[model samples]
Target: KVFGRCELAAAMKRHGLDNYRGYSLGNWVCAAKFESNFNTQATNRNTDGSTDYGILQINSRWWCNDGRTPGSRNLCNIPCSALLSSDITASVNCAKKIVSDGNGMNAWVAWRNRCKGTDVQAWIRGCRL
Candidate 1:
């Protein structure tokens, strides 16, 4: 479930994430790049022992179930594994839910660190969208 930049942007546009929720589309793309490199299968274990799952790297501590983590809030209520698919639907839907939870894109640390208050237009450069 790895997408090259242009392919990812096309999907992001079609999936309605471009500029969604008062965020710059480039910020979303930037988050994707830093979080998972556009690979839906990406996962990383955090220092806290919770894993980041999928393209948006939804954390097992709160967003979804990883089976290894106990007491997950599972706010998305979808399995963390569900986000590893190439379909991109689950991740996008879960991300929207996270944003609506009053965090905006701030739910993702990658967004706050790299995408926020920066010129991120290069993230979407050359995308036909």
Candidate 2:
């Protein structure tokens, strides 16, 4: 499922992304916007033989396991398919784990280049969080 902008913001807020890892909910929303455009089924394969999966674009090499990524650590201990689910719970949980592991939001290039040091609050405007 693809989420509308405000819908994604609201859902992230409800899921405790508001202040996870010192990043505002808006920052998370912004990343999702640029990374997957709120599409839960989004997937991208990297030239390094790793694949990114789902709305948050969690990676197969280090985060979720796809049973195919050559050096997959499966640090999130989740199937890559789980991240593609519309439910989004697994994606959210895995994202939090990624941050708490000290990877920080910069683990996502979209967040680093686009959301960092910006007025991210606009990403959540009118969402009434």
Candidate 3:
């Protein structure tokens, strides 16, 4: 499923991501824009042998078990397939886990490079939050 900016905002809010761990809704939207462009099925194979999956691109090595990444911890305790589904609940759950685990939003390099410390209002503008 491909979500528009406002659509993703509504979904994230529904799943408790609006301000989870001090990150703003706009920040989350910004991260999603750069991570997967709001596409639920996005996947990227990393050079470190980890695959990123879903809208938030949770990593296989640490978040979900893909049965391929070496030493996967599956901290989210979810199959990587769960992240790829149109229902983003699993992806949102893992994203919160990543931040709660003390990694912060910087767990996503895209967020760090592109969304961090900037005025991210544009990411959620017109979302009618």
Candidate 4:
């Protein structure tokens, strides 16, 4: 039920992304909106039966280490689960790490321009304090 800046802030803090408070939340939200509409349970399937799940549209099969026959290999690994346990901010921060390798907000800015749209930069500017 969380929404807006407060919700985003909580999520970021939960995922150890406090250092990115300046504009990370906005970029995260932008990616979430574009990728999966911010729905935690959102999922998509490929012809091969592989699936993508969760708010960041993570592939559950990739990260959900339930220990089945083949056993899940931490999917995206421990960091992913740690991030997933938090709110949307965590999810975004996690995604940034996966996509940007700890570059922080710069990665998000790049994602906005390359994947979402060119207007993402301007949008991020507006979200700043």
Worst 10 residues of 2 by lDDT: 120-129
lDDT of 2 by residue, 1-129 (tens): 999888888788788888987889889999999999999999999988899999999999899889888866998888999999888789999999987877699899999999999999998888766
- Expressed as tens digits, the lDDT of each residue in 1-129 for candidate 1 is 889987887887788888788886788788999999999999999988889988899888988888888666898998999989999888988888887788788888889988899888898887787
Better of 2 and 3 by TM-score: 3
What would the TM-scores of all predictions be?
0.93, 0.95, 0.97, 0.51
Cα-lDDT of candidate 1? 0.87
On lDDT, the candidate that comes out on top is 3
lDDT for every model?
Answer: 0.87, 0.89, 0.92, 0.47
lDDT of 1 at 29: 84
lDDT, residue 73, candidate 1:
81
Candidate 4 structure quality by residue, lDDT tens digits, 16-40: 5443444444455566555555556
Give me the candidate number with maximum TM-score.
Answer: 3
Worst 10 residues of 1 by lDDT: 64-73
Off by over 4 Å in 2: none
